Enzyme design. Structure first.
Site: not given
Lengths: 249, 245
Positions: A91, A93, A96
């Site tokens: 996880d 996330k 970018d």
């Protein structure tokens, strides 16, 4: 004439291999549970995985909070994942631009792509975030989840944003296998829906999440409870979530 | 319109922003180096060689193949000597105990060496709230990602306004924005603009669109002579800034 079982979905012509593997494990073990391993030490991670592996379809990690991370720790976790039959979801996330997330996924000290079946991404940067991850993940037969909605106060992942997440998933369906969301965001049965649920204990209940809102997988915290109570809770939770899934069939 | 030196002395200025603004004025630099390398040795060589030309060094610690915390302690020594801030471009997005641990703990120990980090606003103010619990005691600052440089970015319109509001509401910790233009009229906030080269020219970004600091990677990092390139970009960005006073 009716709703599709997990096993039926695993056989769909356009199903992603990782999705199919996950769906077959859910059907086989009668589990909807994604367990959050929010721990700081390798021993905690591996012992939780060993104890609760039989009850879950997936273990959600945050390797960047693991104080004693090594790749050897990850290899031990993978062995547990294979022995007990669950996927590993990091996880992270990713959020970018494409060129950066490619290196963050493949490289650094964590080498996430070498051990994580699934990772997730925020869609705010545009489809480049998915493109960059896909460059690494597709040759390695990995999958990705896109964060389409969030339950937190002030979340901006609503309306057109959510629709944009779904469009991105469809544009990259060789790599994106589903969504993290509060409810179903797509009718396409090849996509998995993961949704936050109430933690293990001795609107967020399995009955609402899996039964009423039709999510596939419930993301559950491990609870601030004993190991004995945790093992018991995991099995009761699994049965309740599974029964909720069966009720919708 | 206001000089960097003057902004450094504003009543509501954050100490980290003040520190940054004063060294920008001292060194005649509003250049942030994007240190996009995968080896610790390359990171430290860039920081030493190019430190005098920059106000800030932007890192991705999670791309270093040979990270150790001793590398970041040596980077701090260079930052103190050459006078620049260390900005870890981690783009935090989690909340609660997780984001606190991601900032303070794990192997990277980001809060122990990064003057600045950045955060997404998509989850709501929970990201900043979590980071702030760790960063505020450590006298750190945060930048909010209000716009992005990438194709198909969803950080537009009302999203960007939400970022600005969040900044204002957390001004004890938030010192500015990553954005393509000025998004707040409050001079206490810094604006840093990614993807600058040579619309993405220093003169447009700083001179016309009102951003404060240019973030430059490839144009310096891949140059035949990196120090010459860094000074070239520094001079261009600084002249763009003086042009608007």
């Amino acid at each position: 004439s009716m709703e599709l079982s997990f096993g039926a979905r695993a056989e769909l012509p356009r199903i992603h291999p990782v999705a199919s593997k996950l769906l077959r494990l859910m059907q086989k073990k009668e589990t909807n549970l994604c367990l959050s391993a929010d721990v700081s030490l390798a021993r905690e991670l591996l012992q939780l995985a060993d104890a609760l592996g039989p009850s879950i379809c997936m273990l959600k990690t945050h390797v960047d909070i693991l104080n004693d991370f090594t790749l050897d720790v990850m290899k031990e976790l993978i062995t547990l994942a294979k022995c007990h039959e669950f996927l590993i979801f990091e996880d992270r996330k990713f959020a970018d631009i494409g060129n950066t997330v490619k290196k963050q996924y493949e490289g650094g000290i964590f080498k996430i792509a070498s051990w994580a079946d699934l990772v997730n991404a925020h869609v705010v940067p545009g489809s480049g975030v998915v493109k960059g991850l896909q460059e690494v993940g597709l040759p390695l037969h990995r999958g990705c989840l896109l964060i389409a909605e969030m339950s937190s106060t002030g979340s901006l992942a609503t309306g057109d944003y959510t629709r944009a997440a779904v469009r991105m998933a469809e544009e990259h369906s060789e790599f994106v296998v589903g969504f993290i969301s509060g409810s179903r965001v797509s009718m396409k049965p090849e996509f998995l829906h993961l949704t936050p649920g109430v933690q293990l204990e001795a609107y967020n209940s399995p009955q609402e999440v899996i039964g009423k809102r039709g999510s596939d997988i419930i993301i559950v915290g491990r609870g601030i409870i004993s190991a004995a109570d945790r093992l018991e809770a995991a099995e009761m939770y699994r049965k309740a979530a599974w029964e909720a899934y069966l009720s919708r069939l």
